[PDB]
Amino acid sequence: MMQFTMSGTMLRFDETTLRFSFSRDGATWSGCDGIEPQLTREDRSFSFAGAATVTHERIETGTGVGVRSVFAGFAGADYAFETYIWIERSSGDVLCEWVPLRECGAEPRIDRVLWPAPLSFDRADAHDVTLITHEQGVMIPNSWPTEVGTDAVSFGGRFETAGGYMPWFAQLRSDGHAYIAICETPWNAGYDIDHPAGGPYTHVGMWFEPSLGRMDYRRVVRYRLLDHADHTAICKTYRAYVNERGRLRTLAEKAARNPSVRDLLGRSWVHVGIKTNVQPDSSFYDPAQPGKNDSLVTFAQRERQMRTLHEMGAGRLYLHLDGWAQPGYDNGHPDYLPACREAGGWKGMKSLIDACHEQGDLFGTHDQYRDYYFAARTFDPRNAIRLADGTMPEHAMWAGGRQTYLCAELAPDYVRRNFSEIATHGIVLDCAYLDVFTCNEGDECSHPEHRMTRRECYERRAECFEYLLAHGILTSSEEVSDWAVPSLVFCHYAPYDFQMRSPDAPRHGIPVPLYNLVYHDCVIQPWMMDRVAGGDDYMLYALLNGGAPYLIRDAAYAGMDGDMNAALRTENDIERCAVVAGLHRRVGMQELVRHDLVGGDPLVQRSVFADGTAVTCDFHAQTYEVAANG
Numbered sequence: 331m332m333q334f335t336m337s338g339t340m341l342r343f344d345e346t347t348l349r350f351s352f353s354r355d356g357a358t359w360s361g362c363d364g365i366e367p368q369l370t371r372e373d374r375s376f377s378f379a380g381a382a383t384v385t386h387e388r389i390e391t392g393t394g395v396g397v398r399s400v401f402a403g404f405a406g407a408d409y410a411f412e413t414y415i416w417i418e419r420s421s422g423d424v425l426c427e428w429v430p431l432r433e434c435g436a437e438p439r440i441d442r443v444l445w446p447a448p449l450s451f452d453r454a455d456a457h458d459v460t461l462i463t464h465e466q467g468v469m470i471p472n473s474w475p476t477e478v479g480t481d482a483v484s485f486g487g488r489f490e491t492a493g494g495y496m497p498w499f500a501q502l503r504s505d506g507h508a509y510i511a512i513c514e515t516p517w518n519a520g521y522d523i524d525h526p527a528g529g530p531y532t533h534v535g536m537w538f539e540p541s542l543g544r545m546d547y548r549r550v551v552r553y554r555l556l557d558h559a560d561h562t563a564i565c566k567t568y569r570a571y572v573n574e575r576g577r578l579r580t581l582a583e584k585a586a587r588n589p590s591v592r593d594l595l596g597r598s599w600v601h602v603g604i605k606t607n608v609q610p611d612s613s614f615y616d617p618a619q620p621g622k623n624d625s626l627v628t629f630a631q632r633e634r635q636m637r638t639l640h641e642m643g644a645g646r647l648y649l650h651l652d653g654w655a656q657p658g659y660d661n662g663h664p665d666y667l668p669a670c671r672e673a674g675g676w677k678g679m680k681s682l683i684d685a686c687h688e689q690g691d692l693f694g695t696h697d698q699y700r701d702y703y704f705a706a707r708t709f710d711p712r713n714a715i716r717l718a719d720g721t722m723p724e725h726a727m728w729a730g731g732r733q734t735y736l737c738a739e740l741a742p743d744y745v746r747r748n749f750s751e752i753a754t755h756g757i758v759l760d761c762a763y764l765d766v767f768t769c770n771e772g773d774e775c776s777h778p779e780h781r782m783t784r785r786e787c788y789e790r791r792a793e794c795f796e797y798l799l800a801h802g803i804l805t806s807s808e809e810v811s812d813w814a815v816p817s818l819v820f821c822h823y824a825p826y827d828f829q830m831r832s833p834d835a836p837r838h839g840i841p842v843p844l845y846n847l848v849y850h851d852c853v854i855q856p857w858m859m860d861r862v863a864g865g866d867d868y869m870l871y872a873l874l875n876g877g878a879p880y881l882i883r884d885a886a887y888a889g890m891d892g893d894m895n896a897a898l899r900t901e902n903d904i905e906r907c908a909v910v911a912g913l914h915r916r917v918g919m920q921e922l923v924r925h926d927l928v929g930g931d932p933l934v935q936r937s938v939f940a941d942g943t944a945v946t947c948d949f950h951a952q953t954y955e956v957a958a959n960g
């Protein structure tokens with residue numbers, strides 16, 4: 331056994347078990363008993379202690395003190411690596427480094443790495459909770475009724491996706507003593523969660539996958555232990571962390587570059603489409619109903635629709651237009667041109683835009699630069715992703731049918747080409763929507779002509795956005811995975827997980843806005859307005875989160891993109907929008923300082939902002955209150 335103390339914190343680490351535990355402000359935490367850190371190969375799991383040779387080195391640096399462990403020989407295969415577990419002098423934080431060394435013609439490839447092993451947290455106490463970044467956020471009591479497994483989180487608990495908006499998780503006791511684990515190297519990483527139904531425990535661990543088939547580079551987790559800590563405070567920890575590395579890009583900062591940003595406050599959302607053209611090979615094809623597959627609303631009709639919506643006194647509107655190009659929604663991409671002839675052509679579309687501006691309303695196209703359809707006019711496999719095994723992925727899920735994925739290295743080329751074309755026919759977009767980018771994982775590509783790491787992928791996607799900000803077109807994408815913050819103005823939404831499920835489907839936990847706690851002054855988000863019959867009004871959640879409202883939110887596919895059943899429930903729309911929007915017109919660019927569960931009652935909550943303005947929402951009474959005091 332090796333023990334360390336420094337700057338308020340103590341790390342102990344057992345040379346034989348490898349289990350570690352660390353302590354600060356007198357609370358302790360330890361690795362779970364009997365769960366060990368593991369490699370995983372195509373052909374079996376190893377513990378790290380399974381190593382043929384293991385050494386340990388006690389180490390003191392100018393920066394900190396801890397231990398460095400080499401691990402060599404496995405099964406019989408060669409293969410080695412290190413770990414380094416240590417206390418930063420400056421801060422009283424603990425840092426965990428998994429470090430590749432030798433990999434060889436491995437055989438098989440190391441498929442995953444579960445380390446550091448999850449911290450013991452097995453109480454049951456209902457005020458003993460776990461926080462996770464699955465979409466807008468989830469608080470998970472060690473009691474909580476329902477099962478929560480990794481396999482029930484989107485994208486398998488992958489960071490930089492809807493599955494984990496931000497690269498961290500945290501576990502908090504009723505004490506007020508908590509820990510936050512931040513993934514400093516997320517691009518090939520995610521979390522794992524095991525909460526059996528009814529608890530008593532909740533285990534959470536970081537996993538790491540290879541980068542183009544090799545672990546390649548150091549992976550690093552940073553733990554900060556807290557005292558007198560609520561879920562709001564925990565969020566701030568990470569906030570600070572990000573700003574301390576200069577990726578807390580505020581709306582303000584963004585405004586100073588493109589001032590139209592401000593124009594987005596108060597506005598109301600209108601998501602609706604032109605052409606629909608589901609293909610025979612599409613997983614959505616209905617070989618009966620040819621009308622369901624194939625439908626068209628002209629630019630003209632959308633023009634009328636928008637006038638009408640002004641006259642009725644809707645107010646300030648952003649229009650997002652799906653399906654505006656010749657191929658039809660989710661057809662032809664990236665060759666999504668020209669604007670649909672049978673809908674009006676460039677003229678009908680230009681005419682419609684002009685008209686939105688003319689009543690002080692804004693407008694974005696719905697566009698796509700990852701999905702790459704075989705049908706596209708200039709389809710060519712040499713532009714497509716190859717996976718680390720050299721294979722080219724395929725599917726035919728969406729409208730346009732058979733597709734692969736465009737290597738992002740080349741996306742910016744195609745953004746530049748398309749949008750330049752759009753703007754030569756007198757179209758002047760206020761915004762644009764680059765689909766998928768911020769929802770899905772970043773691809774990796776082994777094609778030698780455009781080799782690209784997941785890390786690199788997010789950088790290209792961000793380059794796509796930046797072309798738009800540079801031509802005064804604001805940027806939107808599907809959701810809000812935190813990589814995109816520096817370049818992302820607003821989204822299609824930042825929902826909680828339970829909004830993307832049937833209301834009948836049990837929830838995984840209390841809906842707390844972890845993302846907006848961190849980023850509400852950096853990204854504008856519209857919100858669902860649907861009322862659940864026998865349940866919640868989703869407007870209520872809009873308020874807590876200080877967002878703008880969906881007025882009209884047409885699905886593109888029945889069932890998809892949080893399209894609620896019909897076990898639904900609402901008249902009085904514009905009114906409802908106007909209420910939430912005027913809140914948005916106020917505090918839309920401010921921090922969100924606090925969120926609190928009133929009296930520790932889950933179904934009553936308050937969100938306090940920078941200007942003092944508080945939002946109390948009661949989910950028994952289905953009632954809501956917007957003050958000014960705080």
Ligand SMILES: CC(=O)N[C@H]1CN[C@H](CO)[C@H](O)[C@@H]1O
Binds near residue numbers: 701822887
């Ligand atoms: C909300 C939204 O635009 N979701 C889209 C997300 N992307 C898929 C295709 O990748 C579909 O177009 C889907 O409708």
Ligand SMILES: [Ca+2]
Binds near residue numbers: 601652696
């Ligand atoms: Ca859309």
Ligand SMILES: [Zn+2]
Binds near residue numbers: 714715716
């Ligand atoms: Zn490539």
